Amino acid sequence: EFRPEMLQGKKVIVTGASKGIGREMAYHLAKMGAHVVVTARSKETLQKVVSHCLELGAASAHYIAGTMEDMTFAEQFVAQAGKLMGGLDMLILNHITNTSLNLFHDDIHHVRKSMEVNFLSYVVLTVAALPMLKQSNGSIVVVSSLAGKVAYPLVAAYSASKFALDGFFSSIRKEYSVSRVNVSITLCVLGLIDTETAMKAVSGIVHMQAAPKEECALEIIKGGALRQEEVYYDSSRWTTLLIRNPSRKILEELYSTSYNWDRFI
Amino acid sequence: EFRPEMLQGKKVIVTGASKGIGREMAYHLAKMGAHVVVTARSKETLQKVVSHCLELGAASAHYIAGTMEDMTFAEQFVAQAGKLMGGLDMLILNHITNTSLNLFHDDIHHVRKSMEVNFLSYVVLTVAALPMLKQSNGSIVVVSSLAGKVAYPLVAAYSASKFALDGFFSSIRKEYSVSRVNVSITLCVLGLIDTETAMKAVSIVHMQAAPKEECALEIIKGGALRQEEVYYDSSRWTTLLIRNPSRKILEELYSTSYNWDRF
Ligand SMILES: NC(=O)C1=CN([C@@H]2O[C@H](COP(=O)(O)OP(=O)(O)OC[C@H]3O[C@@H](n4cnc5c(N)ncnc54)[C@H](OP(=O)(O)O)[C@@H]3O)[C@@H](O)[C@H]2O)C=CC1
Ligand SMILES: NC(=O)C1=CN([C@@H]2O[C@H](COP(=O)(O)OP(=O)(O)OC[C@H]3O[C@@H](n4cnc5c(N)ncnc54)[C@H](OP(=O)(O)O)[C@@H]3O)[C@@H](O)[C@H]2O)C=CC1
Ligand SMILES: CC(C)(C)c1c(C(=O)N[C@H]2[C@@H]3C[C@H]4C[C@@H](C3)C[C@@H]2C4)cnn1-c1ccc(C(=O)O)cc1
Ligand SMILES: CC(C)(C)c1c(C(=O)N[C@H]2[C@@H]3C[C@H]4C[C@@H](C3)C[C@@H]2C4)cnn1-c1ccc(C(=O)O)cc1
Ligand SMILES: [Cl-]
Ligand SMILES: [Cl-]
């Protein structure tokens, strides 16, 4: 179904691309011959990722360094990236604030910082990217987790922010259908993935088994390119089968049928 | 299974109690003879509510007016309410920032205000109530929506905040089990309900609303019975289809596979 030629010459933004899954996606897009604008806080690591993207064969690879804590950076970054590539075809929202496995006690500051970085910044980015994506019949790719579909201990603030992405983007997708906005939204529900961040977070939990970041990153690109609503990627075949909720799809399809919202458009 | 005597003499907080579902819950708790501390921004409507609660037979009814936009109010309110009742048995988190059905365009301010009011304030109130509920083996009751389990158009910021409550509280419930915290968490997944707010928002041809009075009772029954989730819609189709057993199987496998005792 998917072809690598589908990404050739496309204008793609990847957030949290200095390392992990974001970096792997940037490299994948580069091998496919895409124009890429990557971001993270570290200018040096980004410069190393951009250098490799050009070697891989990216049509054009650029970086803009800043913190997604700053909503003015987030808004401006989209404009600057859009000018560099002369448009936008895909927006890959992937960055997250630093998190570790820990019991929740009193950390409102972490809960809010998770909400601002992992969620609000995504909305600010989308808002700023939507005119370019509308004129290119584009794609938003939102990187979530199993922890953003199912409840796990030790990642309460993280789970709260990934659950919010589902609520927001799945709702805005329903709206795009009514308001006939031909911009696709892909929510990526990932299991544990073997990035240095995750592997350092999980050190010692021997029974916990990570999936390849390389294939994971490809599966995210394939999903958005094919305009799929949801992408699932875990190492367990048990999880992949059980993660899907058809009961939700039924309730959503019934409301889509039962109501006409044309007197809002 | 449930008995009204279960709430007699209990120390309950109800947020967003000047109107709608919150008001109805306060009155229900008053009929059952509980000690109640109610909150919303309007002092006068709250005073009329605290006066009806005493007539209905509440053991003690009090009000503290303020905005849950203010996290310091939220934190302090719990301490003050706790002092007025000399403890805390149940925390009923119900308030929300004003929302209407509309397409999302550029409203970051609404998305953030919805997250501060509908979500963060709940975490602030929970943190502040926890020692008191711990010493009383208490209950947190979180009022969510179908829109906090399933995706609907025109309530993006609202859906995002109700989805966050699920993520946060369901995760902390897993933690309370590991850390052996005997404080229950009830998430209430409500369908459309006939409150003036809802009926004004829907003035949506075919939408059936459910009775606010029964709804409010069903929320009390659920928390009192320490149920993890409460479902209340007018459709029998919705109530059957709203449950996610796939996620409970996944949760039970992780509960089994891992031991987190060193946390
Ligand atoms: N790996 C896993 O096990 C799982 C990953 N996921 C999701 O995958 C995505 C990527 O994760 P992963 O590849 O492991 O992460 P990494 O930690 O390896 O990469 C995170 C990236 O985000 C950047 N970043 C961190 N903080 C900020 C900030 N405040 N502002 C801007 N950029 C920031 C980092 O660079 P810098 O610090 O230099 O700014 C880096 O480029 C996330 O959305 C995560 O939730 C989902 C489930 C599991
Ligand atoms: N009604 C329905 O159809 C549905 C309701 N729900 C949920 O049920 C709960 C109650 O809804 P409902 O009774 O219909 O709503 P209402 O609008 O009737 O009542 C909301 C309450 O919150 C208070 N409140 C509003 N803004 C603030 C604020 N900034 N700070 C503090 N308090 C505030 C209000 O008091 P005041 O203005 O005086 O401060 C009021 O008492 C909510 O959690 C809602 O999401 C879920 C699904 C459907
Ligand atoms: C680690 C956990 C639970 C949270 C998880 C995730 C996730 O979102 N992990 C985050 C990543 C970024 C941050 C650092 C690390 C890695 C921890 C978390 C914060 C994705 N799958 N998954 C998971 C792992 C194992 C199993 C299982 O064996 O049953 C099921 C699901
Ligand atoms: C109104 C809507 C969709 C969002 C909804 C809710 C909800 O969250 N209602 C709140 C009310 C108060 C505030 C203003 C309004 C009304 C929106 C919300 C905030 C709870 N069920 N439900 C709903 C209604 C009908 C159907 C159906 O016929 O298939 C399915 C679900
Ligand atoms: Cl890595
Ligand atoms: Cl009302």
Show residues of chain B in contact with A150, CB under 8 Å.
247, 250-251, 254
Q: Residue type at A30?
A: A
Nearest to A245 by CA among B251, B150, B168: B150
H-state helical runs in A135-212: 156-178, 196-201
Nearest to B226 by CA among B130, B147, B138, B101: B138
The method recorded for this entry reads X-ray
Q: Do B174 and A153 touch (CB under 8 A)?
A: yes
In short, whether A261's Cβ falls inside 6 Å of ligand 4 is no
Q: 3-state DSSP call for residue A225?
A: helix
The total of other beta-carbon atoms located within 10 Å of residue B25's CB is 29
Pick the ligand that lies closest to the CA of residue B100.
4
User: Who contacts B94 (Cβ-Cβ below 8 Å, separation ≥6)?
Assistant: B14, B15, B16, B17, B21, B22, B25, B141, B143
CA distances from A16 to A20, A105, A223, B45, B248 (A): 8, 28, 19, 49, 32
Q: Rounded to 5 degrees, what angle do the CA atoms B177, B74, B179 make?
A: 15
Mutate to test the pocket of ligand 4, among B155, B195, B239 (most ligand atoms within 8 A of CB): B155
User: Who contacts B131 (Cβ-Cβ below 8 Å, separation ≥6)?
Assistant: none
Show residues of chain B in contact with A155, CB under 8 Å.
171
Instruction: Tell me the shortest Cα–Cα distance from B239 to chain A, in angstroms.
Output: 10
Domains of chain B: 1-263 (3.40.50.720)
Q: Chain A: residue nearest B241 by CA?
A: A247
| Residue located via tokens 């501390």 | B37
Nearest to B93 by CA among B59, B133, B60, B149: B133
The resolution, in angstroms to one decimal, equals: 2.8
Whether B102 and B23 have beta carbons less than 8 Å apart is answered as no
Query: Ramachandran region of residue A102, left (φ > 0), alpha (ψ -120 to 50) or beta?
Result: beta
Exposed / middle / buried, residue B1 (Cβ in 10 Å: 0-12, 13-18, 19+)? exposed
Q: Do B103 and A264 touch (CB under 8 A)?
A: yes
Q: Does A179 count as an annotated binding residue?
A: no
Whether A38 and A46 have beta carbons less than 8 Å apart is answered as yes
Q: Rounded to 5 degrees, what angle do the CA atoms B145, B147, B152 make?
A: 160
Q: Does B40 count as an annotated binding residue?
A: yes
Tokens of B67: 């905005």
Whether B31 and B57 have beta carbons less than 8 Å apart is answered as yes
Instruction: Return the number of CB contacts < 8 Å for A and B.
Output: 189
Q: Rounded to 5 degrees, what angle do the CA atoms A35, A36, A38 make?
A: 170
CA–CA distance, A208 with B258 (Å, rounded to integer): 9
Least CB-CB distance to B172: which of A104, A123, A147? A104
Least CB-CB distance to A259: which of B179, B204, B237? B204
DSSP structure string for B48-91:
HHHHHHHHHT-SEEEE----TT-HHHHHHHHHHHHHHHTS-SEE
Q: Residue type at B174?
A: K
Show residues of chain B in contact with A101, CB under 8 Å.
263
Q: Do B154 and A264 touch (CB under 8 A)?
A: yes
Pick the ligand that lies closest to the CA of residue A257.
4
Q: What is the DSSP letter of B193?
A: B
CA–CA distance, B236 with B227 (Å, rounded to integer): 20
The total of other beta-carbon atoms located within 10 Å of residue B100's CB is 11
Strands of the sheet with A230-233, listed across from one edge: A60-63, A35-38, A11-14, A90-93, A139-145, A184-190, A230-233
Mutate to test the pocket of ligand 1, among A13, A25, A39, A41 (most ligand atoms within 8 A of CB): A41
Whether B15 and B68 have beta carbons less than 8 Å apart is answered as yes
